[PDB]
Design a protein around this ligand. Sequence first.
Ligand SMILES: Nc1nc2c(ncn2[C@@H]2O[C@H](COP(=O)(O)O)[C@@H](O)[C@H]2O)c(=O)[nH]1
Ligand SMILES: [K+]
Length: 193
Amino acid sequence: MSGPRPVVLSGPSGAGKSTLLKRLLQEHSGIFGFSVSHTTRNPRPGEENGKDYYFVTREVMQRDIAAGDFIEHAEFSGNLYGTSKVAVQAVQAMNRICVLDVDLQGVRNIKATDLRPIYISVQPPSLHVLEQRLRQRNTETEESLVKRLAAAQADMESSKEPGLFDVVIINDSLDQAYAELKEALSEEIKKAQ
Ligand SMILES: Nc1nc2c(ncn2[C@@H]2O[C@H](COP(=O)(O)O)[C@@H](O)[C@H]2O)c(=O)[nH]1
Ligand SMILES: [K+]
């Protein structure tokens, strides 16, 4: 619909997509806006309601799902996540480029919509490096960690699927990965300016 072409980032959680989006929204806040997803998982230290996520209960999400409030939703490692219609509309109303981060299920969901995004996957240099990065903040139970590593492996395997992602970025250095994110969006950034 109306507004510039949206941007969908995916890849394993913890491998860089969220940090890179945060950096992009700091540097180019006049050009981009972030879609604030709903989730039923608990907040981590430093996360902010209405900025990182809308943190709601399952009961509340289910009411909103039943009302048709969501573009897409997914179950991931025991919790529910989703992109509300209003989250994307808020950015489009600002005439900004909407940026989203979602899992592989979300990528497939959005492929079936009319949003016509560019799709960028952000990969860790290895599963081993991802696991080390995750165990630093150590926000997950062991059961969740197991589900998350399984999902990360599936994600990496699918990143090379023909036609799925427009660009696949390997995040060995955040400065380098961030340059490559802007590279993929350079025409859109120039036009917005
Ligand atoms: N499909 C979908 N996935 C989401 C959404 N919001 C977050 N996720 C994904 O859920 C996974 C877990 O996120 P985390 O719990 O680590 O913040 C990540 O891949 C993240 O991008 C959403 O609105 N829809
Ligand atoms: K999100």
